Nucleic acid binder design. Sequence first.
DNA 1: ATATGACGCT
DNA 2: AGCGTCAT
Length: 431
Amino acid sequence: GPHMATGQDRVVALVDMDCFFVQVEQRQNPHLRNKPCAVVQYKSWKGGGIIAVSYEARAFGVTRSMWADDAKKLCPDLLLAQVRESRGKANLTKYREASVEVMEIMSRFAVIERASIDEAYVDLTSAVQERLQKLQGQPISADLLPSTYIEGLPQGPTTVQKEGMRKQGLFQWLDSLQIDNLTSPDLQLTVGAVIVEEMRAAIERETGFQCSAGISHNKVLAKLACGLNKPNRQTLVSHGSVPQLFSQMPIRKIRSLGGKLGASVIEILGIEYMGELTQFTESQLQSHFGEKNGSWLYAMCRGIEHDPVKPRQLPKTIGCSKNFPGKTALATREQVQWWLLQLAQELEERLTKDRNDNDRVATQLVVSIRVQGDKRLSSLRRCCALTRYDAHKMSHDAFTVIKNCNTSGIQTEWSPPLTMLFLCATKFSAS
DNA sequence: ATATGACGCT
DNA sequence: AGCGTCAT
Ligand SMILES: Nc1ccn([C@H]2C[C@H](O)[C@@H](COP(=O)(O)NP(=O)(O)OP(=O)(O)O)O2)c(=O)n1
Ligand SMILES: [Mg+2]
Ligand SMILES: [Mg+2]
């Protein structure tokens, strides 16, 4: 009827840096540019664990979480950059500082939600509307969109080359555009995409880093759109593109469906693709997955989703962690204390930096451990008051709240051994 | 032998 | 409060 909300109220973008840690290393070491390379942690065991892979090394099948020694068998020319190590653990400061560079540039254009070290959602609804009153009724030239793909286009009688494809779809999209109607959702996305071109040009201009972006009407679609044409390209996913796109879209590819919920949707409903969800009533979906999940699934498979872009570029928690897999699991009281102290010393540096930059203090310390055999991330979390940014107090207090977990008759020893220590400062207060 | 961060459920 | 899910 005339009372159907199509989920086209917003223009939302998601910007994600291309092989981000690699780009940070490649900017600093020009010998690594335009080469198969990867960023690795801890060179001692099997060459180090790979955490980021350039697109040149991906062409050989090198992936994240692979051992560097194994990646070298797939790609003998692979160059490696090692993560900084401080206090016997990985130190990600260089990438956090690179991340702040990118976030501050994006923040100049619109309200952003920091979503990870290398990505942020952008709510462009206001910027698009303002622009719709300033760029006048002046048409949108294809030159304003030199790196944009229109998902689903070109269609019909028109190639062979990807940029030929990109242009043809953009041409079909822009020819079909009704610019005399400032409330066309498709025109709004187009203006959003122009804006995202400009903010991606600014990021590259001011940092050297390339990135990809999705532009659509909500966070889920924008994130999906972002990966469609990685790297160094952006993708507009219109409401109209959703039925064809979702008809062969595996369910696990949708944000929040990559885990157990996504698996249960597939197993319980007997489907493979996002589009098959539309044949179920909302009540049926709620009967299987809960009121909130069923409702979310019912709207989402029609391309509709209402999670807002939260105005937040600052983390809500600040944390330091280290895993101790296998025979490295911590098995004496001295080890636990020493590592807690190493974690607390890095955390104190980060928190002091945070308070000076951001006018806030953390008030609660969360201590998370994992014990050997437990396959869950955390086996146990406990908390106490974070009153002084003092590493020796924080490490001692963290020890106080977990020391009863030790079921060891001998007091020098720690049993069962700990496979993870994690200190997280939270409950930030205005200061 | 897979360093962190956001959040939901009870 | 403490645990579970989902994610980069
Ligand atoms: N488990 C993980 C996942 C990502 N990261 C770091 C390394 C990544 O370069 C950076 C961003 O992760 P990402 O966006 O998922 N993939 P990345 O940016 O490396 O390549 P793209 O696939 O986005 O082009 O977070 C990590 O340190 N541990
Ligand atoms: Mg990325
Ligand atoms: Mg990312």
